[PDB]
Design a binder for this molecule. Sequence first.
Ligand SMILES: Cc1n[nH]c(C)c1-c1ccc(NC(=O)[C@@H](NC(=O)c2ccnn2C(C)C)C(C2CC2)C2CC2)cc1
Lengths: 98, 99
Amino acid sequence: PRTVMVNLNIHSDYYNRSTSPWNLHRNEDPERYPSVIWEAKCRHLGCINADGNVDYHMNSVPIQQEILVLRREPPHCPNSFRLEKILVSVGCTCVTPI
Amino acid sequence: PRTVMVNLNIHSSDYYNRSTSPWNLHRNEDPERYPSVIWEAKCRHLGCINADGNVDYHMNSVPIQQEILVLRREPPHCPNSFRLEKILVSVGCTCVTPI
Ligand SMILES: Cc1n[nH]c(C)c1-c1ccc(NC(=O)[C@@H](NC(=O)c2ccnn2C(C)C)C(C2CC2)C2CC2)cc1
């Protein structure tokens, strides 16, 4: 029960040179703001070494960020939302295994 | 300039450490902003950690930047009313080949 008013009028190629490079995947949800979210997906299980080979002794892992979205509530009523918490992959890094 | 109503009642730990491009979180607090607390990544090194545990400058640690929205109180100090703002946030670091 904590309601506020929001004006929705608003204010690299690392993915490619990274030893843990990634692609983006589109998710669209018309009941959600933002409706389109791009999620990072690691290209490889391992990490690319200085020869351009995959080395599976290291791991590409996605960096997951807690992020909020607006969900329409009650549904289809266009002016009114609840804040939701989701986990989104924003990129990949290379970790030494445990 | 569409205005909407929002209910603010809401719905792998150690990468920062095991990464060849490791990083720390900096807390930035702004009481005029929701969320007021944002944790930003900063790369520990300009280079990347190699298999021996040393900084190797043949490669670069770079921040992963994500465009994110925050709520700014408008008019200021009025606690229940906001405009959406766009900012750039570092979420972590990756290791890139230079050119
Ligand atoms: C479009 C797209 N592609 N890939 C991603 C990820 C996204 C993509 C998806 C969603 C969003 N959401 C936000 O920006 C929300 N902001 C946060 O969640 C936020 C702000 C500060 N700190 N945070 C985190 C760190 C807690 C925002 C709500 C949607 C209006 C603000 C109100 C609370 C931003 C990009």
